[PDB]
Ligand SMILES: *[C@@H]1O[C@H](CO)[C@@H](O[C@@H]2O[C@H](CO)[C@@H](O[C@H]3O[C@H](CO)[C@@H](O)[C@H](O)[C@@H]3O)[C@H](O)[C@H]2NC(C)=O)[C@H](O)[C@H]1NC(C)=O
Ligand SMILES: *[C@@H]1O[C@H](CO)[C@@H](O[C@@H]2O[C@H](CO)[C@@H](O[C@H]3O[C@H](CO)[C@@H](O)[C@H](O)[C@@H]3O)[C@H](O)[C@H]2NC(C)=O)[C@H](O)[C@H]1NC(C)=O
């Protein structure tokens with residue numbers, strides 16, 4: 001099946017996509033890496049010290065780079081801790097879930113959101129490679145070669161607790 | 168009997184323990200955390216880009232903070248150096264295996280060691296909590312509250328690739 005190899009927690013600065021409406025469309029350009037992996041980028045609004053309710057989920061293959069699939073719910077936010085509630089459409093933040101239109105999973109920052117939370121947004125990419133090999137415990141040398149662009153990104157919120165290995 | 172929850176790789180600066188002896192005694196003050204955990208601090212000698220052959224092993228309970236048990240061998244060193252190359256008693260480095268009375272597991276830096284080695288020493292604490300609950304995959308909120316002092320320590324040698332959790 002798809003045996004996980006680990007997760008990379010990197011930070012990407014969003015790029016403004018010129019829009020037709022009054023809203024701000026933000027895109028976090030993902031490196032075109034052709035390896036078996038899952039890409040979950042969390043939209044962190046630094047100014048409000050909170051995150052958006054849903055995260056953009058992408059998937060990569062050995063013959064295709066990260067391609068958008070769906071906008072899954074944010075289960076483990078960077079801040080959270082029940083001190084505050086995640087930012088929703090009501091708060092002026094929405095991720096489009098369209099696969100037909102060229103957008104997705106780009107963040108929509110409507111004028112309804114705090115002035116100016118859009119410029120404060122930062123991505124927390126959770127790149128998690130996998131392999132068909134059950135005997136592989138970490139990414140091999142040629143896989144780390146292909147993932148160079150992701151590996152060279154700055155670390156963002158990488159946890160202190162290293163999970164235990166299968167015993 | 169004791170299910171692991173993970174490991175914290177933190178750095179601690181050693182404190183010089185006064186002694187009327189020619190040797191230097193270094194202590195890495197561990198936070199008094201009352202949780203079920205194992206504490207393995209590695210004595211890294213930064214100047215020589217090497218570590219000491221043995222590590223001080225401590226154990227904590229919900230009724231007692233980290234208490235020293237024994238000086239176990241360094242299996243996974245920092246600089247990736249092969250075992251046998253690690254700084255031994257011959258090189259002027261020794262960890263006290265004494266349970267009674269005190270001064271264990273404190274590092275002894277004898278005068279025959281390279282000048283400036285003692286001041287260069289840094290600890291690599293490997294704090295690994297463990298629960299009796301088989302259905303617990305990560306430390307709970309009240310456990311992370313108690314481990315605040317360890318969590319606020321600076322990271323030291325923790326890898327960039329986070330291994331996958333108990334899933335597949
Ligand atoms: C990248 O991930 C792919 C899964 O998303 C994976 O492809 C799958 O590989 C398996 C074999 O590992 C194929 O299944 C074949 O294996 C059985 C025995 O278990 C044979 O009897 C059959 O030939 C069977 O088809 C899947 O067909 C395949 N799935 C698809 C369509 O992708 C890749 O192997 C992964 N690549 C790397 C390099 O990690
Ligand atoms: C902290 O770790 C302890 C283990 O190092 C653990 O204590 C052990 O808990 C089990 C039950 O979960 C006890 O039960 C066993 O022994 C009794 C007789 O004493 C039998 O009746 C039981 O059937 C079973 O075999 C152990 O006695 C106990 N061991 C000791 C002495 O510590 C704690 O539960 C852990 N605490 C937390 C909060 O994580």
Ligand SMILES: *[C@@H]1O[C@H](CO)[C@@H](O[C@@H]2O[C@H](CO)[C@@H](O)[C@H](O)[C@H]2NC(C)=O)[C@H](O)[C@H]1NC(C)=O
Nearest residue numbers: 054055069070071072073094095096097098099
């Ligand atoms: C984004 O769109 C997909 C549809 O492609 C949604 O996925 C559905 O999820 C529900 C359960 O939550 C299932 O009942 C459906 O079968 C799924 N559809 C399929 C076939 O993929 C997804 O929930 C949407 N995300 C958002 C923004 O809520």
Ligand SMILES: *[C@@H]1O[C@H](CO)[C@@H](O[C@@H]2O[C@H](CO)[C@@H](O)[C@H](O)[C@H]2NC(C)=O)[C@H](O)[C@H]1NC(C)=O
Nearest residue numbers: 023088089090091092093094108110111112113
């Ligand atoms: C702030 O603005 C957005 C739109 O600019 C609002 O979102 C819409 O909410 C209505 C509720 O009736 C829904 O029908 C739409 O699906 C939402 N629009 C889209 C496509 O995003 C949001 O409710 C506003 N928040 C405030 C302050 O009321």
Ligand SMILES: *[C@@H]1O[C@H](CO)[C@@H](O[C@@H]2O[C@H](CO)[C@@H](O)[C@H](O)[C@H]2NC(C)=O)[C@H](O)[C@H]1NC(C)=O
Nearest residue numbers: 190255256257258259260261275277278279280
């Ligand atoms: C450096 O000095 C220490 C003592 O100051 C030496 O350690 C002793 O080595 C002998 C080997 O026969 C043993 O009896 C003991 O394990 C050591 N004594 C203690 C308790 O420290 C060490 O051998 C010296 N290294 C050099 C350069 O010869």
Ligand SMILES: *[C@@H]1O[C@H](CO)[C@@H](O)[C@H](O)[C@H]1NC(C)=O
Nearest residue numbers: 221236237238239240264265
């Ligand atoms: C320290 O003492 C313990 C006693 O349990 C012993 O098992 C161990 O071999 C000693 N450590 C070393 C390697 O000197």
